Design a protein around this ligand. Structure first.
Ligand SMILES: [Cl-]
Ligand SMILES: [Cl-]
Ligand SMILES: [Cl-]
Ligand SMILES: [Cl-]
Lengths: 173, 173, 173, 173
């Protein structure tokens, strides 16, 4: 067991493990979104790339939490990873709306854990979330909301044209 | 007081201070326009960048006038800076129309001060405006009018599509 | 409106807009201080440079707050900018005393907003101020207090000599 | 005679020749000021350098006027060059006051010639003065007034100390 653990509550330990699960779930969702937009009958490469990048980012967030768990002397515990919510993700607009829902859920879990850390007087935990998670999440959600706005403006009366143009002229390919 | 002042009227001194106010006002207007187009529910980065650049340019014009005021032995006097005329700026077309109105007002103030300088036989003042302001202003207004024309051509029956395409393919991002 | 806003109170939004006004006011004060020390009958270049640098720094602080406002889904709202408190700023000592007063006011506004953010359980806001404002402000006030001390030591019975030497040997020109 | 002369009045031609004389006179004054501050019993190298630089600048101004005279098809006519007004120039403060008097006289001659050119509808002459003389003169007078202010601040009750320090810490050596 730990010879190092200090000021690290069972409650925070458990909430960290749960958050790891949420980040790995989110990573899996993004993997599925990326491969959906890689389908020959969907074929939006910049959309595929956007979500594949996010799958990696979420995996990396989970890994940072697990590294932290160990640094503090807690025990990483893994649970089953549920599959994503959909098998087919509709339009780029549908997908970006689902992604923002997902991110708002992750953000609320970060805030909840921050609040628990504050209540437990665990400033290392609070600082960790502030330094590596909270602003990264705010920036991502801003980016998604910007994307959503542009996608919505492009629907007009020519949805296919708008969806092509967004992928070509906003997203990286 | 000044040991240096020569051929520098009170009328020109006061008109310079007023012009400084007009340029700082214009800078503030452009700051507001830039942050409006940075909103997640507006999200037109190239439009944001265009107006932020102008906020800087107008600040720089004010600073050059203040430097000149001191070179001539006049006294810089600052007044309250009124807030911009709008809190929300509508479409790119709305914004570019407002910007041209603003620039025509600044240009007329430059012309008025030039005429005062001519009447006061102040060739340094007249040369200063000719060398650093008048052509810069004519060039900017030409650019804005070119932009306006392109924006107008793109309204068609698909305003959102046209507004996206202008931002993507004309403005720098 | 925002599709992104989360955990961002109306109270914090409004306090951010007010703080923007305070930073732009401070920027305007520094602009006036800089041009005062550029007067031919004042002529203290290093003092001019010090305050001009600060005018830029304060503008940049306002811009960071406005960027943050948008990242969080709040709405930037601009108000009139009052003119600086003085038209002529006296000695270098007078000016540095006024600058420290100004900075202590800005610092107290940062602390007040931090406290509001804490009360509203808004850790992103709190982290933002900690990461980009609070230490920058403490460092600036330390620098000003160091300057004040040196200026005061140099008054002696030869104020002009001391004011020249401080500008030449402490301040950057 | 000229095959080229066009829109170049006798009045402007003569005023140009007179202005050449004034610039060469000023150059001679600066030569004398420079060698005065090079005296072993004066020995202020940075003051010497400042005035020697100006002797060159004024010579160059005369040369530009003479080049212009020829470009326009006028005839350069040289007159006797009176010696400078003093054989010994007193303190640095005395000298800088005399230099500002001299420069204000040159500046008024530039303005007078500009006005003559305007009256004669000679825009090349007017542009020539605006482009190469008027702002150069305003900038020099500003510099001198800045110097004067610093010199005056340093008199205090220790004139020698102040005169040494100005030469060492403001002027280039
Ligand atoms: Cl199981
Ligand atoms: Cl007022
Ligand atoms: Cl108002
Ligand atoms: Cl003779």
């Amino acid at each position: 067991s730990s010879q190092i653990r200090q000021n690290y509550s069972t409650e925070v330990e458990a909430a960290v493990n749960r958050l790891v699960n949420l980040y790995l779930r989110a990573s899996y969702t993004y993997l599925s979104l990326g491969f959906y937009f890689d389908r020959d009958d969907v074929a939006l490469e910049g959309v595929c790339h956007f979500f594949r990048e996010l799958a990696e980012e979420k995996r990396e967030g989970a890994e940072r939490l697990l590294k932290m768990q160990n640094q503090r002397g807690g025990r990483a515990l893994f649970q089953d990873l549920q599959k994503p919510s959909q098998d087919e993700w509709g339009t780029t607009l549908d997908a970006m709306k689902a992604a923002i829902v997902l991110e708002k859920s992750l953000n609320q879990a970060l805030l909840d854990l921050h609040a628990l850390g504050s209540a437990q007087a665990d400033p290392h935990l609070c600082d960790f979330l502030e330094s590596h998670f909270l602003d990264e999440e705010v920036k991502l959600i801003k980016k998604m909301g910007d994307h959503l706005t542009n996608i919505q403006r492009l629907v007009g009366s020519q949805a296919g044209l708008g969806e092509y143009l967004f992928e070509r002229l906003t997203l990286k390919h």
